[PDB]
Amino acid sequence: AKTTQEKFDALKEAGVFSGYPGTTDAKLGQDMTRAEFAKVLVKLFGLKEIHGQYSYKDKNYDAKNWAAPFIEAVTAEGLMQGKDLTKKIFDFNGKITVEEASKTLVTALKLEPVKDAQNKATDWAKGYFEAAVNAGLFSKDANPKANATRAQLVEAAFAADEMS
Ligand SMILES: [Cl-]
Ligand SMILES: [Cl-]
Numbered sequence: 757a758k759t760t761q762e763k764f765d766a767l768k769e770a771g772v773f774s775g776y777p778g779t780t781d782a783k784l785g786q787d788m789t790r791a792e793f794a795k796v797l798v799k800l801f802g803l804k805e806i807h808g809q810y811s812y813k814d815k816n817y818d819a820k821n822w823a824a825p826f827i828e829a830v831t832a833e834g835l836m837q838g839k840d841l842t843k844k845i846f847d848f849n850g851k852i853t854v855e856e857a858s859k860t861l862v863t864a865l866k867l868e869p870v871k872d873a874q875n876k877a878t879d880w881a882k883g884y885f886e887a888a889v890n891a892g893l894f895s896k897d898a899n900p901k902a903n904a905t906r907a908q909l910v911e912a913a914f915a916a917d918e919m920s
Contacts, residue, residue: 760784760907763914772799772913773906784907791823791848793857793909794830800913801864801920803829812838812846823848835860855881855900857909858888861916867891876900888912891919 758766764782767773773796775782788796798805806828810817817824827846830836836856839847855877862869862884869883870890877885877900885900893912894900904912 758914760910764906764910767910767913767917770799772796772917773910782906782910784905784910786906787851787903788906788909789848790836790846790850790852790856791821791827793852793860794823794826794836794848796909796913797835797860797864798826798829800917801833803833805829806832811844812848813844814846814848817846817848821848830860833864835863851903852909853900854894854898854902854904854908855885857904857912858894858900859884861893861912862887862891865891865916865919891915 761782761784764773764784768775797803805825807825809828810824811828811831827836827848838845839850859881867887870886871883873882873886875882875886881900885894888894889896893915894908898908
């Protein structure tokens with residue numbers, strides 16, 4: 757049984773997660789931005805970065821934003837969409853949620869959302885969260901609406917990698 761720390765160390769070795777300067781602390785209790793999570797997905801699934809395309813209207817979403825090539829890759833791949841679709845806002849500094857991460861991973865693994873799933877997720881996500889739980893990516897007792905912890909994302913990424 758690998759611990760969350762051992763799963764993180766393996767993912768860091770692989771270039772999927774990064775740690776922090778000066779310490780071996782992986783901050784497993786802390787949160788992750790949507791920009792960072794798009795980079796995680798690009799590394800985890802070996803996606804091509806997309807330069808010189810900008811699908812969203814967020815302020816400071818341009819060539820000087822380090823995250824755009826990753827955000828564009830997960831967008832073209834169908835993994836992430838904006839937080840709001842009429843204004844085309846990605847919310848790159850916003851934190852990724854359990855249920856958002858669930859939808860990305862379920863889609864990337866070509867799994868099927870569960871129809872008429874009953875759980876605490878936002879309506880759009882109930883099926884994705886349920887599919888993610890059933891695949892072992894998140895615990896049934898996780899809060900789907902919460903910001904996902906780095907621990908949770910490590911576990912989910914690790915499991916997804918094994919399924920691929
Ligand atoms: Cl921590
Ligand atoms: Cl969990």
